[model samples]
Target: GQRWELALGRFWDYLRWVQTLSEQVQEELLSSQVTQELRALMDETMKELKAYKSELEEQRLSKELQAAQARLGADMEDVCGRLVQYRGEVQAMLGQSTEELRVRLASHLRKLRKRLLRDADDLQKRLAVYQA
Candidate 1:
C-alpha cells in the first residue's frame, strides 16, 4: 500500500513535468513564429526604404543624401542576411531542444508506467491479504 502511494505520487509528478514541458514547447513555437513575423515586417520596411532611395536618386539629392541612402541600402542588406542566418540557427536549436524534451518525456512515462504496474500488483496482494 505504501508502495502504491509512492507510485501514485510519482505519477502526479510526472504529469506535472509533462505539462511544464508542453508549455515550454508551446512558448518556443510561439516565439519562433513571432520572430518570423517580425522579420517579415522588417523586410517590408526595407523595401519601402529602397523605394525612398529611388526617390532620392530621382531628385538628384545632395552628396550627403546620396551617401546616406547608399549606406542605408548596404546596411539593410546586411541586416537581412544576418537575420536569415540567425533565424536558421535558432530554428535548429529549437528543433533539437524540442526533440530532446520529447525523448525525455517518453522515457519518463515508460518508467512511470512500469513502476505503477508493479505497485498496483503489490496493492492487489495487500487487498487480497486484507480480505482473507
Candidate 2:
C-alpha cells in the first residue's frame, strides 16, 4: 500500500505562501507526491494568478493615486484663494487706519494754526494745558 498520504492541507499552505512560486516551492512541490498533471496545473494557474494580481495592484494604485492628486490640486486652489482673501482684508484695514490717522492729524493741524493766528485766548489756554 502507498505510504501515509501527503498532507494536501500542508501543501495547500505552501501554495498560498508561494504565490510567486519559487524554485524552493518547486523542490518541495515535486517532492510532495504531486504528479506531472498537478505540476503543469500549478504553474499555469500560478502564472495566471501572478498576472491577475499585478493588474489589480496597478489598477488600484492608478485609481487611488489619480484621485489623491486631483484632490490635492483642488485643495491647493482653495488655500491660495483663502490666503489672498485674508491678506486683502487685513491690508485694507491697515490702509483705512492710515487714512483715518491722516485726517485726524490734518484736523489737529488746522486747529493749531487757527489758534496761532486768530485765537490768542485759545493758544494761552492750550499752552496752559500743555504745561500742566
Candidate 3:
C-alpha cells in the first residue's frame, strides 16, 4: 500500500507539471496574437488618416483654383469696360475735330496717348478691386 501511494503521488506531480507548461504556452500564444492584431489595427488606421489628409488637401487646392479663375474673369471684364470707354472717347474726339489735313493727322497722334492714361487709371481701379 505504501509503494502504491508513492507511485500515485509521483503521477499527480507529473500531471501538474504538464498542466503548468500547457498554461504557459497558451498565455504566450495569446499575447503574441494580441500584439499582432494591435499592430494591424494601427497600420490600417494610419493608412486611412493619410488618405483623408491627401483628399482634404486636394479639395483645398481645387477651391483655390476656382477662386483664381473667377478673379481672372472679373479682371478681364474690367479691362474690357475700360477699352470700350477709350474707344468711345476717341470717336467723339474725331467727330469734333475739323482741322486741315496735316493738322488732323497731327491731332490723331495724341489719341493713343490719352487712351493709355485711361488704361492706366482702369488698371489702378482693378488693383484696388483685387486688393479688396
Candidate 4:
C-alpha cells in the first residue's frame, strides 16, 4: 500500500488538537467489532478536519481585517482633502492682506513726494549737494 501525506498549509499547529481527539477515539473504537480495522483511517480524517476548520476561521478573520483597513483609508483621505482646502483659503487671505499693505505704502510715498515742492533755488542747492 502507498502512503499519502496531507499538506496542512497554515493550520499545521492545529494538528495537536486533532491528535488528542484521535487518541481518545482510537481507544474507544479500536477494539469494537466493525470499527477495529478503520481506526487509523478515522484518525487521519479527524486530523484533516481540524486543519480545514482552522483555515476557515483564519480566512474569515483576514477578510474582516482587510475591510476595516479599507474604511480607515477612505476616512483619512476625506480628512486630508478638507485640510488642503482650508490651507488654500488661509493662503488667499494672506495674499489679499499683502496687496492691501502694498497699496497703502505706495499712496503714502506718493503723498510725501507731492508735499516736497521744489523751487529753482531748492533744485540748484540739491543738485550742488548731489554733485559734491
The models' CA-based lDDT, in order, is 0.45, 0.37, 0.38, 0.35
lDDT string for model 2 (1-132, tens) is 111112222323433443333446334332433333334443443444335434545545444433433443333233233333433544567645434433443454344333323332332233233333
Runs in model 1 deviating more than 4 A are 1-97
TM-scores across all candidates?
0.29, 0.24, 0.26, 0.24
Candidate 2: regions farther than 4 A off: 1-60, 94-132
Look at candidate 2 and tell me the lDDT of residue 51: 50
Number of the predicted model whose TM-score against the real structure is largest: 1
Provide the lDDT at 22 for model 3: 48
Better candidate by TM-score, 1 or 4: 1
lDDT of 2 at 50: 38
> Lowest lDDT 10-mer window, candidate 2?
1-10
Using lDDT as the measure, the top candidate is 1
Instruction: Tell me model 1's lDDT, rounded to 2 decimals.
Output: 0.45
Minimum summed lDDT over a 10-residue window in model 4 is located at 1-10
lDDT of 4 by residue, 1-132 (tens): 101123222212232222232445324322342132233443453455345434545545434433433343333233233333433543667645444433443454344323222221243243233333
Better of 2 and 4 by lDDT: 2
List candidate 4 stretches off by more than 4 Å. 1-60, 94-132
